Short mmCIF file of C-alpha atoms in Angstrom, two decimals:
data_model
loop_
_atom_site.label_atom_id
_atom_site.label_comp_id
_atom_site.label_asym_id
_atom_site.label_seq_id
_atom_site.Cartn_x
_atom_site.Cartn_y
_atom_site.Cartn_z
CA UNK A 1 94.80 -10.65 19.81
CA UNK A 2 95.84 -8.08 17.26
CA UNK A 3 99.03 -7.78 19.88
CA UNK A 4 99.50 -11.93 18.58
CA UNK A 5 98.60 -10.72 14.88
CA UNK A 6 101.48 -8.20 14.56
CA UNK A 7 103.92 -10.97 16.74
CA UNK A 8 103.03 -13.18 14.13
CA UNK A 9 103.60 -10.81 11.22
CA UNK A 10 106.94 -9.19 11.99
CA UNK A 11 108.88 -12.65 13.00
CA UNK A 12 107.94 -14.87 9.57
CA UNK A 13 110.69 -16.90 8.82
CA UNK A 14 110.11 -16.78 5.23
CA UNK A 15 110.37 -12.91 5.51
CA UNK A 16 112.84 -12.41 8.38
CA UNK A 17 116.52 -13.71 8.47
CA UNK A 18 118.55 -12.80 11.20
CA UNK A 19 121.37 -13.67 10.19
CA UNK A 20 121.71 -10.22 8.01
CA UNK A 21 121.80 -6.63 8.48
CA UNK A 22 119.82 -3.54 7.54
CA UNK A 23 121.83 -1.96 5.08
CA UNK A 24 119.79 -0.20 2.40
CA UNK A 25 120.85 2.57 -0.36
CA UNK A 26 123.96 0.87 -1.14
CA UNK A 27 125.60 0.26 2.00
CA UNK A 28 124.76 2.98 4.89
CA UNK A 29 125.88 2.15 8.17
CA UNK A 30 123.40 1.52 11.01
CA UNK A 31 124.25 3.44 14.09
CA UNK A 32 124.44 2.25 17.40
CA UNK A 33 123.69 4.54 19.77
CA UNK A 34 125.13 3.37 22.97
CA UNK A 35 125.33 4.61 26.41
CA UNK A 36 126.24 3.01 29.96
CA UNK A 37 124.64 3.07 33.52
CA UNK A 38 126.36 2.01 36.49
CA UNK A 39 124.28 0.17 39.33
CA UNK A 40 126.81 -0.24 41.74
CA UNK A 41 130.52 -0.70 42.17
CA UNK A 42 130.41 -4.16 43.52
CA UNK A 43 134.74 -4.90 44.34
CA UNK A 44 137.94 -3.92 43.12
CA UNK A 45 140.22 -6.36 43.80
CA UNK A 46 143.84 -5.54 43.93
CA UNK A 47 145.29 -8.60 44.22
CA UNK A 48 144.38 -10.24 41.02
CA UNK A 49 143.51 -6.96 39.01
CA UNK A 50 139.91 -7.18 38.89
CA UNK A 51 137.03 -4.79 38.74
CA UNK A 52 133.75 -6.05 39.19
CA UNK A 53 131.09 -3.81 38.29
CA UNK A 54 127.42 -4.13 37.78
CA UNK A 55 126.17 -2.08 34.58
CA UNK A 56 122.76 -1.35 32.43
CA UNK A 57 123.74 -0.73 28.37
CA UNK A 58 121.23 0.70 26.94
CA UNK A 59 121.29 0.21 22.72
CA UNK A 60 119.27 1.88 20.78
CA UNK A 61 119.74 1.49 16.55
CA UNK A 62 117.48 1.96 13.56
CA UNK A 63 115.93 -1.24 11.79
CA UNK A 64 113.75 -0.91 8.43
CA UNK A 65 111.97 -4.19 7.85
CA UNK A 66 109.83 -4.39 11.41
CA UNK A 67 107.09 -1.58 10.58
CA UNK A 68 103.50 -1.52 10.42
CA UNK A 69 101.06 1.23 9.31
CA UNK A 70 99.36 1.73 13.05
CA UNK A 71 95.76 2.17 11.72
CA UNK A 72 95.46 -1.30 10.23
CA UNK A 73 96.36 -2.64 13.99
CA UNK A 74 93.51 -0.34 15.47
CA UNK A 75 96.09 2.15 17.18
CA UNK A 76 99.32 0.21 18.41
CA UNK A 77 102.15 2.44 18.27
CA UNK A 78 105.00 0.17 20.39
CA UNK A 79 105.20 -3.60 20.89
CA UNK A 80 107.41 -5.82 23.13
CA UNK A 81 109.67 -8.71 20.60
CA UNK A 82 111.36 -11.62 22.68
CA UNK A 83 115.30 -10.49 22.31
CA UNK A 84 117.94 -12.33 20.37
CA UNK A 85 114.65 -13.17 18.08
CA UNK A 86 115.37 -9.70 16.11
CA UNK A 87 119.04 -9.11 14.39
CA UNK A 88 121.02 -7.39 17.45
CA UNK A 89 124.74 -6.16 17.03
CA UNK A 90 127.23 -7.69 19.35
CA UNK A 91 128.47 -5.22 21.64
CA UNK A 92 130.79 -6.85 24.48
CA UNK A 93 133.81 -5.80 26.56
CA UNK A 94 136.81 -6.43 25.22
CA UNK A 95 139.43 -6.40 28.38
CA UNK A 96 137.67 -9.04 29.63
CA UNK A 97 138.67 -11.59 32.45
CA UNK A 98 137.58 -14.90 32.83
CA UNK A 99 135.91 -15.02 29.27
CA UNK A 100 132.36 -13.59 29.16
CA UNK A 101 131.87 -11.72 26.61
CA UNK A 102 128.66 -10.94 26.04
CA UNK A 103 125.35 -9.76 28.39
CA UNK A 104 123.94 -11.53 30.97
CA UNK A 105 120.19 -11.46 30.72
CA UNK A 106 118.67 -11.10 27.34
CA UNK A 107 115.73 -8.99 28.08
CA UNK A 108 113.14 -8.09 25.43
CA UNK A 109 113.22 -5.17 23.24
CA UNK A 110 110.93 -2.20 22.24
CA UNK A 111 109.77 -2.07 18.95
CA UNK A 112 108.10 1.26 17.82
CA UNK A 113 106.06 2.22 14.61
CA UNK A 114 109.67 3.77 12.82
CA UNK A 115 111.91 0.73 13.07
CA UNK A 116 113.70 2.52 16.04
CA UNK A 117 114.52 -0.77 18.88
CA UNK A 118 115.65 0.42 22.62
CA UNK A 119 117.14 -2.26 23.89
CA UNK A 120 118.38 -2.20 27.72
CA UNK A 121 119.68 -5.94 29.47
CA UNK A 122 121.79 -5.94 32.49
CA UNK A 123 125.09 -7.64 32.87
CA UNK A 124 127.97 -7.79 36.08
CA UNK A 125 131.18 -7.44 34.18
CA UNK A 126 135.02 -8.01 35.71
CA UNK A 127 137.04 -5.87 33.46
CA UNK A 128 140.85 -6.14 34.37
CA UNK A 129 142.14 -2.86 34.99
CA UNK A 130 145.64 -1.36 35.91
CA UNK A 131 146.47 -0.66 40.14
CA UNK A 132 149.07 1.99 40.52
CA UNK B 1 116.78 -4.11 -5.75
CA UNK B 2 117.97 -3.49 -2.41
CA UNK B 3 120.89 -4.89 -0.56
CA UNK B 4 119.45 -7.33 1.86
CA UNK B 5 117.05 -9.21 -0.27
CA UNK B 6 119.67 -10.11 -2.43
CA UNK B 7 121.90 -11.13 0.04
CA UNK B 8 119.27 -13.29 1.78
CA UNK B 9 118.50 -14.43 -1.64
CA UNK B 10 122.42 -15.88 -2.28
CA UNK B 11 122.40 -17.08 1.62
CA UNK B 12 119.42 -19.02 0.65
CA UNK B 13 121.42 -20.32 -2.59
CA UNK B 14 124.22 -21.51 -1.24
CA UNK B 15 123.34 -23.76 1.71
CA UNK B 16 121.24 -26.12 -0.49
CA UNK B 17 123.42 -28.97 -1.14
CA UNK B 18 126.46 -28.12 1.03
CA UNK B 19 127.48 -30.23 3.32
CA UNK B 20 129.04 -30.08 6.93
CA UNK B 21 131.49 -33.54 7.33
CA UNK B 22 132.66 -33.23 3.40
CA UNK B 23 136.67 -32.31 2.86
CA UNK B 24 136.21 -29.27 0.58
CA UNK B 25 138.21 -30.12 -1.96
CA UNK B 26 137.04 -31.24 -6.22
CA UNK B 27 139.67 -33.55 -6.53
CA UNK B 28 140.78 -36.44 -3.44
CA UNK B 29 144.89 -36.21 -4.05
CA UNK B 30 144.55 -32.06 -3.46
CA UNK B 31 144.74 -30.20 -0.03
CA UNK B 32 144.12 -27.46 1.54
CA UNK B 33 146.21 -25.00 3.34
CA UNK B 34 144.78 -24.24 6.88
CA UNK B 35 147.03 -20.70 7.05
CA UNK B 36 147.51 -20.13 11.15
CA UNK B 37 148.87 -17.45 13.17
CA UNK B 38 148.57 -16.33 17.16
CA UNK B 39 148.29 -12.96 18.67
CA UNK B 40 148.61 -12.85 22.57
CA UNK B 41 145.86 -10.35 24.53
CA UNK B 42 147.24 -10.71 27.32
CA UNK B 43 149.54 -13.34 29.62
CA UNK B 44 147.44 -13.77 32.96
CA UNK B 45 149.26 -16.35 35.27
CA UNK C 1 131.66 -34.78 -4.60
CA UNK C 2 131.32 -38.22 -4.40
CA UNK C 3 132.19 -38.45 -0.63
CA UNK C 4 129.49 -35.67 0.04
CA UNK C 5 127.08 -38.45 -1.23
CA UNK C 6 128.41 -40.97 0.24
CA UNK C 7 128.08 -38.77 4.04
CA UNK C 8 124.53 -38.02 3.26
CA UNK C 9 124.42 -42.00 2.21
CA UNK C 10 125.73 -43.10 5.62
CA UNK C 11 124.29 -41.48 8.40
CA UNK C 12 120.81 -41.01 6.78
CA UNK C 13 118.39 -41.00 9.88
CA UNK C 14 115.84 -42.96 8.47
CA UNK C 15 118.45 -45.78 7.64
CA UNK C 16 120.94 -45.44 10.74
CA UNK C 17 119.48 -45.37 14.28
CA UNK C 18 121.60 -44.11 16.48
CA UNK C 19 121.36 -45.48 20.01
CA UNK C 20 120.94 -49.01 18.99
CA UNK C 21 123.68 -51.51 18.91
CA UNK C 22 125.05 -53.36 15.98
CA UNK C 23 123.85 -56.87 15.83
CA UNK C 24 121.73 -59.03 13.33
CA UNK C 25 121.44 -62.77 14.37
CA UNK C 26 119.58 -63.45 17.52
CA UNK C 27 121.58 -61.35 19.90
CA UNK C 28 125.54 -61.63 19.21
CA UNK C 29 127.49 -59.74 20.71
CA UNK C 30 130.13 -56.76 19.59
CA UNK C 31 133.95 -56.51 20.57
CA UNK C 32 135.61 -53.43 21.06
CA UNK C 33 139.03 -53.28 21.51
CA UNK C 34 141.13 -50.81 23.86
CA UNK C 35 144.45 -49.82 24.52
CA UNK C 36 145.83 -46.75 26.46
CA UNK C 37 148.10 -44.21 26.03
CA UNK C 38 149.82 -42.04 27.91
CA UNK C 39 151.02 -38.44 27.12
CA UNK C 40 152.04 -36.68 30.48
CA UNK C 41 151.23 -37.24 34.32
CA UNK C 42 150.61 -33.82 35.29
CA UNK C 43 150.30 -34.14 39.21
CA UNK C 44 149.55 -36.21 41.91
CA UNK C 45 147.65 -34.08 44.75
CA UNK C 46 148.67 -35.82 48.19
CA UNK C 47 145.89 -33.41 50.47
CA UNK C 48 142.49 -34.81 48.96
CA UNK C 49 144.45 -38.19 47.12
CA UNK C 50 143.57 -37.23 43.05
CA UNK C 51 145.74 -38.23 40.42
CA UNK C 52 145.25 -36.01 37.44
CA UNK C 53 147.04 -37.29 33.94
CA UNK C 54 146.15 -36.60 30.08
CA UNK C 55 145.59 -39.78 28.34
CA UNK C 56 144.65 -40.72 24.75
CA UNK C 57 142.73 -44.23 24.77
CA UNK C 58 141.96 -45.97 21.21
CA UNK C 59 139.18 -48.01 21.09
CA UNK C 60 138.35 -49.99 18.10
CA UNK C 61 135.26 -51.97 17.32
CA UNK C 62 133.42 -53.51 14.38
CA UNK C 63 129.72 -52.48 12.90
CA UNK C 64 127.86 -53.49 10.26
CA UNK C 65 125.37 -51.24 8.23
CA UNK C 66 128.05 -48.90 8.46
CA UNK C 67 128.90 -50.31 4.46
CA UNK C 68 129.38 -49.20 1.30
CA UNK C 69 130.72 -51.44 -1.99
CA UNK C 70 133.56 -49.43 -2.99
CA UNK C 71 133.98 -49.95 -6.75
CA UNK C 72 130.76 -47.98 -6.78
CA UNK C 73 131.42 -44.95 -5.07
CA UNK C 74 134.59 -44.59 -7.37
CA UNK C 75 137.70 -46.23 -5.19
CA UNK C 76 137.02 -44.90 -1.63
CA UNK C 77 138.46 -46.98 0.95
CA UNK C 78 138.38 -45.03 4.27
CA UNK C 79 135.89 -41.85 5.31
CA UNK C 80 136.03 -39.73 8.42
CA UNK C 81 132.66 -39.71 10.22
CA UNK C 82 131.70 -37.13 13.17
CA UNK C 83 131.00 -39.20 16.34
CA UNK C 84 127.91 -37.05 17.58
CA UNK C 85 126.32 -38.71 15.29
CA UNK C 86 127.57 -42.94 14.69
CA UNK C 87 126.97 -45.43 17.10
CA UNK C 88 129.37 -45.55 20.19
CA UNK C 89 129.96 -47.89 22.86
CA UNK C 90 130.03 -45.91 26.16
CA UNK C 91 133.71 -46.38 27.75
CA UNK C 92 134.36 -44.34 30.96
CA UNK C 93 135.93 -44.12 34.35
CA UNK C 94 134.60 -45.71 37.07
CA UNK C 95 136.31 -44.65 40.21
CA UNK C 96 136.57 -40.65 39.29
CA UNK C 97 136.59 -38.33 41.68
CA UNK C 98 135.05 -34.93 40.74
CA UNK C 99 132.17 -36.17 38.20
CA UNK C 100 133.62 -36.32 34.52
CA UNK C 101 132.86 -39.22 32.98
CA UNK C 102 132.90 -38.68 29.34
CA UNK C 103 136.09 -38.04 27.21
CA UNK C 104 136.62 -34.41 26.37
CA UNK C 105 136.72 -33.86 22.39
CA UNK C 106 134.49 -36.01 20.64
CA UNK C 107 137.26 -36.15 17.42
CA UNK C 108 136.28 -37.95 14.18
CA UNK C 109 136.23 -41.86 13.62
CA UNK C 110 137.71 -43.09 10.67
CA UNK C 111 135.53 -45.65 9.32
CA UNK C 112 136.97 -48.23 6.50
CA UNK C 113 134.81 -50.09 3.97
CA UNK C 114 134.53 -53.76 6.48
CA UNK C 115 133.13 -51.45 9.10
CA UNK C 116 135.79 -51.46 11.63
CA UNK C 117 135.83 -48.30 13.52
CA UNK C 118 139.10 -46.65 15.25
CA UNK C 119 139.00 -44.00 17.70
CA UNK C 120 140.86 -41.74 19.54
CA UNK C 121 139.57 -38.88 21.36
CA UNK C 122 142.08 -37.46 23.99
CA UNK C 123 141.13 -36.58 27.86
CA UNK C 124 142.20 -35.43 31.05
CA UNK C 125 141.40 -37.44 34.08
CA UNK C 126 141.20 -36.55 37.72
CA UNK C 127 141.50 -40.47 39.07
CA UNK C 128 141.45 -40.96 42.62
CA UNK C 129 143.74 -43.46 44.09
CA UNK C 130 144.49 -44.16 48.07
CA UNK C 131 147.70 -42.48 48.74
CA UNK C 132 149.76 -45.05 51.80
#
């Protein structure tokens, strides 16, 4: 219940656009702490060029307007926010075959009491990559 | 006073009265110029 | 300015229902008007007998609470309309082999001050045809 309280206070429309990022003291950067995890190799296929790999991404970035003081919630510290509900950055591939671009899944995401959000979705990928 | 209010406070602004379907132009005998230009990634087949 | 009135004049969803059809005395009916034309016949597969081709086809018909009175909306004769959103009679292949059976762009209709509509949306077509 106070789990549906804080779902209900974070995502407000009224308060929450996002279409916008969180920039404060005159234009800082947020940082986007990315790194990869392979799952398995699936085929390299020489004829046509194309690797097809199966990868976790785990994000993990600093937002400023989803906090909460964690005594007035009776002692949550880390909730669970439907993804693509929150701002996310896009991060794709870029040498991409066949034209997906982005993830795969859309997973949720990991909202602590700082504004920190983990953020981990799966994806199979078929980068096009160079045979000698 | 910071950054983002006041940008969600012009996005809010500006999408009142626009509209999709209208030819964005004030006067009807003017035109727009639609610049273009390609860049090839890469040629597959 | 005065077009961007007339567009949120026109297609006002209170006024304009979309999937009815234009008629007003007892159940008359509507005409539309077709012609085809060609732009290229790309191939003609002899091992499964499907023609594929690009075609334009204009079809032209004639509504009639799609009006305005032109002297008051300051000399406007002839408006481009999207055509998610008019009225449309549904025109489609009949013998197609591999299940497409709409037209492929959904372009604008231009839409004069009587009502007559033109259109011209372009397709492919994979038509099947019995190959002696």
């Amino acid at each position: 219940d106070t789990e549906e309280r804080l779902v209900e206070h974070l995502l407000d429309p009224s308060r929450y656009n996002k279409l916008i990022r969180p920039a404060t003291n005159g234009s800082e950067l947020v940082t986007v702490q990315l790194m990869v995890s392979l799952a398995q190799l699936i085929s390299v296929h020489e004829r046509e060029q194309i690797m097809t790999t199966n990868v976790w991404l785990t994000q993990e970035w600093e937002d400023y307007r989803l906090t909460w003081k964690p005594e007035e919630f009776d002692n949550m510290k880390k909730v669970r926010l439907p993804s693509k509900h929150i701002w996310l950055p896009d991060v794709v591939l870029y040498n991409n075959a066949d034209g997906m671009y982005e993830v795969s899944f859309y997973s949720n995401a990991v909202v602590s009491y700082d504004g920190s959000i983990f953020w981990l979705p799966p994806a199979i990928y078929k980068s096009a990559c160079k045979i000698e | 006073e910071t950054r983002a209010h006041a940008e969600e406070r012009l996005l809010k602004k500006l999408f009142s009265g626009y509209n999709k379907w209208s030819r964005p132009v004030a006067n009807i005998s003017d035109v727009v110029l639609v610049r273009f230009g390609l860049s090839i990634a890469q040629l597959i087949d």
